């Protein structure tokens, strides 16, 4: 059967696009991770690198 997406209907029947996010933790290839905290550069003094 088919959805009805006519503009005459209010909240509850109008289309709400949804995307499902689910991860896997059975195999361990150590891939897919996000970057963070890429700061500036410091020279000619003490450095906590």
């Amino acid at each position, epitope marked *: 059967r088919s959805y009805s997406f006519r503009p*005459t*209907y*209010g909240v509850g029947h109008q289309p709400y696009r949804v995307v499902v996010l689910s991860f896997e933790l059975l195999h361990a290839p150590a891939t897919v991770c996000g970057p963070k905290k890429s700061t500036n550069l410091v020279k000619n003094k003490c450095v906590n690198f």
Partner: antibody, heavy 118, light 107 residues
């Protein structure tokens, strides 16, 4: 395609049995069924719905009472209650889905208007 | 719980007259709002599907329009064989509930 009724008589409060309604060849396991109350002094009242996936949805005021059973070959749906509080002066009509999108398969059935009293 | 209320309940004096009966609801609902035509002593019956269709065998004078939680129906023909009662129900929403009841009768 018609419906077969099993019921009648008078029962006391606190007693429950298997209310039974059958089809005339319609699929009973792989179909949608609904139960409603027809009672004197009031309109029709929604009771329960059972889907082909084995999921039952019914009212929260009658929770922990309804136990439904769909027989595979006898084609006769059973329903069992528990702890009747004497408000069942009515009849349980069994029915199908009225319309999914566009369908005229709308055969219904009748029953005996049973009462529960001292 | 969904509560449906209707003003045209008992049209006992509406004999041979234009009928403008209707059903509403508290929460706004779509076209999925059907009706029950219950004869005395027999199960409720469907004439209109999705508040906009017609049963296969019925007189063609029946026409019901439902949009924006307002289902309006008319019966211009006052046939004696349809002494019954009319009910309003909404579906495709949890939970399915029935109306309080309306009376139709020809003197």
């Amino acid at each position: 395609v018609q419906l077969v009724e099993s019921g009648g008589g008078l029962v006391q409060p606190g007693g429950s049995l298997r209310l039974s309604c059958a089809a005339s060849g319609i699929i009973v396991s792989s179909n949608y069924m609904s139960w409603v109350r027809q009672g004197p002094g009031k309109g029709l009242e929604w009771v329960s719905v059972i889907y082909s996936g084995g999921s039952t949805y019914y009212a929260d005021s009658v929770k922990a009472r309804f136990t439904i059973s769909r027989d595979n070959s006898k084609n006769t749906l059973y329903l069992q209650m528990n702890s009747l509080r004497a408000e069942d002066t009515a009849v349980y009509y069994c029915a199908r889905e009225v319309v999914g999108s566009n369908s005229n398969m709308d055969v219904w059935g009748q029953g005996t208007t049973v009462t529960v009293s001292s | 719980d969904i509560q449906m209320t209707q003003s045209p309940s008992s049209l006992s004096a509406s004999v041979g007259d234009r009928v403008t009966i209707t059903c509403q609801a508290s929460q706004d609902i779509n076209i999925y709002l059907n009706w029950y035509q219950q004869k005395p002593g027999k199960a409720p019956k469907l004439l209109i599907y999705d508040a906009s269709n017609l049963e296969t065998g019925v007189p063609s004078r029946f026409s019901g329009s439902g949009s924006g939680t307002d289902f309006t129906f008319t019966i211009n023909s006052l046939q004696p064989e349809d002494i019954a009662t009319y009910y309003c129900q909404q579906y495709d929403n949890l939970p399915r509930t029935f109306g309080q009841g309306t009376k139709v009768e020809i003197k």
